[PDB]
Amino acid sequence: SLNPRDVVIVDFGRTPMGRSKGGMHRNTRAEDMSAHLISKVLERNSKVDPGEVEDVIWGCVNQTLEQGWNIARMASLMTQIPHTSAAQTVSRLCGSSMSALHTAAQAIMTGNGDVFVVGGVEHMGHVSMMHGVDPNPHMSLYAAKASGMMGLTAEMLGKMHGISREQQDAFAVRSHQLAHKATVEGKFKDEIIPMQGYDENGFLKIFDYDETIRPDTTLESLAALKPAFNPKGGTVTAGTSSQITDGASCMIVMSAQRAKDLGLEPLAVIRSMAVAGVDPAIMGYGPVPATQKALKRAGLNMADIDFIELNEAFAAQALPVLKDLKVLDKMNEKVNLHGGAIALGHPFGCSGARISGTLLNVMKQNGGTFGLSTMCIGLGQGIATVFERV
Amino acid sequence: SLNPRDVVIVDFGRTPMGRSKGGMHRNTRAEDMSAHLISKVLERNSKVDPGEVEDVIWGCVNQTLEQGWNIARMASLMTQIPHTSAAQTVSRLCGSSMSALHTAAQAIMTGNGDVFVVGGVEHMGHVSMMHGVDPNPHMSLYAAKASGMMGLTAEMLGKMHGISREQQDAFAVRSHQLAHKATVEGKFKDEIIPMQGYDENGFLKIFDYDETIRPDTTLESLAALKPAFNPKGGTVTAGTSSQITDGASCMIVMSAQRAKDLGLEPLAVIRSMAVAGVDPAIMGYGPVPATQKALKRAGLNMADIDFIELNEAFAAQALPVLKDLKVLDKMNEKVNLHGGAIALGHPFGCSGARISGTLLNVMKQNGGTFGLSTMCIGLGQGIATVFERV
C-alpha cells in the first residue's frame, strides 16, 4: 500500500508555452507568470488549504532582474499562499524544475512537511540565456571553455554516436507533429492552464494552446536549414534544437497520508529519484547515468517502464540517449508521445517538472503504470524521476 | 545510538571573511573561491573519497555573472570532485547556505546518497546586492515595495519591539569585541581555512584572519554614525548592520553509517530542521517561527539548548528575536560567543552554513551538547537547524 510518508502528486498545470521572440508572454513578467499559474492550480484543488504549503520550491536559472532574489517567494507572496509559508528557488540549470520536485519529496519523506508546491519558471524573452555571463578563465584550466556552448556539446555526442542530419531532422518533424496531434485531440487540455496573453497586434486575450508548435515542419524544410553551431560540416541546426520558450510549470505535492485524509485520487506516486554527472563536453549523455541510478533505486528494469518523457535538448543528443537506454526501437510506442521540447520549447527553470508533469498525463491517458522522466543538464549532469500510477 | 541514515557533519571550513570594498578577495572570483575552499576541506579529511560526493549543493543569491549558471557545478569541476558527481545551487536569499545543508541531509536520510558536500558563496564585491534588480510593480498590489529594503524592515521590527539606538550600538560593539577576542585566542583557527589574498598595495599573501572585524569600535564611535535608512528619526545605522563581505563557507556531510565505516568522529549530528514565513515588513522576526518549528521537531525546549548562533542581520532585529525566544538574559552566556555578522560580515550565499559551522565549534570548545543555528530571511522567511555533539 501507500506508506504515510510516500510522495504523492496531487495535480500538474503548465502555462501555454509561448515564443520568446514577440510571443504571447512578451508583456508578462516571470514572477506574475509563476504566481499566477500557482494560484490557478490551487484553485482547481480546493480541498488543499494553501495555508498548509510548507514550502514553495521553484526552479529558475537566470536568477537576475525579474528572476532574481528567490523568485519562489516573490511568487508565493502574490498568491493565496500565506506569508507563514516558506519558499526557495532551486537551480540545477536545465534540471532545476525537477530537482525542486525531489527536494520537496525528500522533505515530505523525512517528516519536515506535509504539503509542498513545486514548479519552475523561465522567461527567456526578458532574461536571455546569454544575459549576464562572465566566463571564468580558470575554467579552461580544468575543462573546455567550449563545453559551455550547449550546441557544440550536441555536435560531439552526435558524432561519437553517429547521428545523421537526416536522423535528426526526422526526429524534429516527429516532435512537432506528435505535439500538434496531441494539441488537437485535446490531450493537453487537462494539463494546460489558460492564461492571458497578447497576440501579434497586442490584443489581450486568453491562450490555451502552444505557439511554439510548428505543424508545417517537414524533412524538406528542415533540410534547408544551415548548421547553427558548426559552420563547416555541422549536423545540429536551429530546427533540431529546443525552442527559446517563455513558460512556467507547476505542481502540488503532499504525503500519501495527508492525501488519504483529504481524500483525493493521486495523479501519480514518486518511486525513485536520482542525479548523475558526466563530462561537460558530452553533457547530452547525462540521462543514461541518472536513469540507471534511478531505476536501480526503483528496483525496476528499463523494460518495466510503460512510458518515457525525455526532454528534447537536441536531436543529436536525445537519440543517443534512447539508443544507449535500449528503448529507441520502442520510441513511437512509449517515448515523448505528446511531442517534446523541439516543438514545446525548453524554458530552463520550467522544463524540469514540465516533462515530469506531461509524463503523468500520458500515463493517465494510455493506462500506464510506471513512467520515467529524465533529462540532460548543462556542464555535465543528469536527473530522472520514476513515478507510478496507482 | 546513531541510525545508519542519520545526517553527520564531518567537518566545517570557511574562508577569511574579507572587505568587499578593496579587500583581500577583490581579485578572487566567487567560483575559484568556492572551488578552492572545497578542495582544501576535502584535503583535510582524506578518508573520504571525493568520488563519493553524490551531490555538491552550494548556496548563492545573486546568481548572475560569476555566480550564474549553477555555480555549484562550476566549482565542483575545478575540484578533485569527479565529473560523475552532481551539483545544484540553492537560493533562499540569506538562508540559502543553510537550506543546502537541509536539502542534502534530507537526501541522505531518504537513501538517495551517502556523502554530500554543502556550502555557500557570495562575492558582493563583484556582484553588488543591488546589481540587476527589476522591481515588479505588481508587488505593490499584494505587499509593500518598501518591505524590500532590508534596512527598513529592521527599523519597523525595532520600533514595534522598542529597541533603542543605545541598545543596538551596544550589541554592535559586542559582536566586534567577541569576534576579535575569539580571533586572538585562535578559537577560529580550527574553522578558518588559510587562503591567498591581496593586501592594500596588492601584494599576494596568505590570510588566516578576518578583515571585517574592527576592534576599535566603541559606543562613542557608533554614536557618531547617522541613520543609514531612516533620515529623520532613525535607529538602525551602518554600524549596527552586517558588513558587505566577500566570503564562502563549506561543509562535508554524510550518513552516520558511512561515517561509522570510514571511522571518524562526527563534528555534530543534525537533529531537526525547519523553515517558516513571516510578513515581508517584519522579516527580521523570522527566526522565532522557524526556531519553534525546529525545536518541536527536535523534541526539545529552548532551555535544553546549550549554545546559539543567530545570524546578526541587524541589531534592531537580532535583539527582538533573542527576547521573544526568551534567551536574551542568557546572551553573553550562550549566544554568538565568537561574534556575529556585525563583525564577521554577511555574505548571503555563505552566511547560512557559516553560522551553522561556527556554532559547531563553539560546542566543541565549551563542551556543548545541543546547538541552534537560526536566521531571518529577506521578504519574510526563517530557517534554523538543531545539531547535537555526540
Added chain:
Amino acid sequence: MIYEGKAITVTALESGIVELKFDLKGESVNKFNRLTLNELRQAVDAIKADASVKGVIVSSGKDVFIVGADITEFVENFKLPDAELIAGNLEANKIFSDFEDLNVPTVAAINGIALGGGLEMCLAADFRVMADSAKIGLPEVKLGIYPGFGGTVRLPRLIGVDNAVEWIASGKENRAEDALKVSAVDAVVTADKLGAAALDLIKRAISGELDYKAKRQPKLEKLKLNAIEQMMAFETAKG
C-alpha cells in the same frame, strides 16, 4: 442614435455593442465641465435603460482623449461652501460609479492624453486599451489638490499602493510603455489599430472569455495588502 449630445454621442455598433464617444463640438479638446458631466449622466442613463446594449466602448473624436477642465471653472468651484462643493463632487462621482456598475463590459479606448478627470473616467471602465503614443496621468497635486473623481480610490486598487502614491504625488504624465508595466492599461496598440483592439476585446468580454466582472471587483473592495504591509507601505510613503 441611442444618444446625441453636444459633447457625447452614444452610437450603436455591431453585435449590440455600443460606442460612447467624447466629441465636444466647437472646442478643440475634451474636458469635464458642467455640460460634459451632465451629458455623460444622460448618456449612461440611456445605456442603463436600453435593455439591448450588451457592450460599451469609450472613445474620443479628438486628438486627445480627455484633458482637464478650464482652470477657470476650478477657481469657481473651490469658492463654493464646503457642504456645496462636496455635494457637487458626490453627484459627479455617482455618474462615474454608475457607469462602473453597468451590467455590461466597458472598455476605455485611450487614443490620446487623458489627464485628471480624463484618466479618472477610464479608471471607471473595466478594461483599457491605450495608443502607443498616448499618455495618462493625475496632475492634481500641481494645483494643490489630488484626484477628485475617484482617482485616489481606483488607482491604488488597480496598479498598487506604492505605484498609486508615486503617480499621484508626482502628477507626472506616464507614457504607454510604463503605463502597461504597472497595469494601468490592459493592452497597448497603435493609433491605427486602436479601434480594432477595443472592439475585439469587448467581444471577448461579452463572450465570457474574459471575466470582466472579476476584473472590476478589485476596485470595489478593500486593498489587498496585509495590515503590516499597509503601515509599512504607507508610513514610508509619508516619510
